[PDB]
Amino acid sequence: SGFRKMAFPSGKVEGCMVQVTCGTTTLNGLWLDDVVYCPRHVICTLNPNYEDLLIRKSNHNFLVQAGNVQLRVIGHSMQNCVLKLKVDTANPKTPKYKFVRIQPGQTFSVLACYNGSPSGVYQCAMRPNFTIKGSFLNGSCGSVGFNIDYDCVSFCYMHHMELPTGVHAGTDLEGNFYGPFVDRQTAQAAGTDTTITVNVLAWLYAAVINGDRWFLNRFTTTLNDFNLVAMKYNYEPLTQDHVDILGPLSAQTGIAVLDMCASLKELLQNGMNGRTILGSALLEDEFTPFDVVRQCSGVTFQ
């Protein structure tokens, strides 16, 4: 038992991290097969026109270091906000992998990197407003977020920028930003965030699986009446699809999803009254139903 914010084992991704240097800019790249992926703002020279900027580059302007081994760029292209550098060497540590664009509410592990070297790994959620509350300093651009399914690394995030609120914005691995953000230094605001309701419910189920039951009650609620209270507390609407996803957890604990909603409603209306759930004095919303099941049942990855 116990319940922790668990990241995926990061080794498969560590083997893909490289340093990309061009001009005075150094950041991280992702080396899969013979392509290095990195944020396009690595290129030389607000309101830049990256097409103009890139047509002016030569391959030899791109310094790619994989450890103490320089990789030479034999080609380059831009795909949305990512730059793709063709190199003459296929990464021998390339895992089996996919690129996935995730939905808000979904979680992933971030391998924070500086100068191509991994610094740490932690678990993130994509917020409803398409930011992530990460931990990123200058030099971390190009660090990636990922999930692992059996043996396959699903890359879903690459880091680009920090918003004035101290939260983070980036792209999928095909260079499309999550949310309304653009990779230029112009005024941009995240958007009002909301709490991921289905995830809070998943985490209450984790608490029950783990022996916290104090927040349960005998009441029930209608999805309709629950969502009325949710909106008042800035919670995302709970859909029937969410209820269905919460099915496996509801069945393992014997607590009807709608009964768990009654508990959450009472927790929203009354607060926690100096008590904690799973070591937290806040309602935690960065565990998906899948996260809870994986950690409470012990799924591994080969």
Ligand X SMILES: *[C@](O)(C(=O)NCC)[C@H](C[C@@H]1CCNC1=O)NC(=O)[C@@H]1[C@@H]2[C@H](CN1C(=O)[C@@H](NC(=O)NC(C)(C)C)C(C)(C)C)C2(C)C
Binding site for ligand X (CB under 6 A): 25-27, 41, 136-141, 160-164, 168, 183, 185-186, 188
Q: Which is nearer to a copy of itself, 17 or 243 (CB)?
A: 17
Chain-centroid distance, C-alpha 139: 18
CA dihedral in degrees (110, 152, 301, 278; nearest 10)? 40
Distance (Å, rounded) from C-alpha 295 to C-alpha 302? 16
Instruction: Examine the residue annotation and report whether 296 is marked as an active-site residue of this protein.
Output: no
Pick one of ligand X, a copy of itself, none as the site partner of residue 254 (Cβ within 5 to 8 A by kind).
none
Alpha carbons 40 and 43: distance in angstroms, whole number = 6
77: partner contacted, choices ligand X, a copy of itself, none (Cβ within 5-8 A by kind): none
CB of 290 to a copy of itself, least distance (A): 13
Please count the residues of the chain.
302
Contacts of 197 (CB under 8 A, 6+ apart): 230, 235, 236, 237, 238, 242, 264, 285
41 is catalytic: yes
Nearest residue to 36 via CA among 80, 72, 81: 72
Q: Which of 22, 113, 124, 141 is catalytic?
A: 141
Q: How far apart are CB 135 and a copy of itself at their closest, in Å? A: 4
Whole-number Å distance between alpha carbons of 28 and 18: 6
Residues that bind a copy of itself (CB under 8 A): 1-12, 14-15, 67, 111-115, 117-122, 124, 133-140, 162, 166-168, 210-211, 276, 279-282, 294-302
Q: Which of 41, 76, 160, 168 is catalytic?
A: 41
Report the nearest approach of a copy of itself to the CB of residue 302 (Å). 5
Active-site positions read: 41, 141
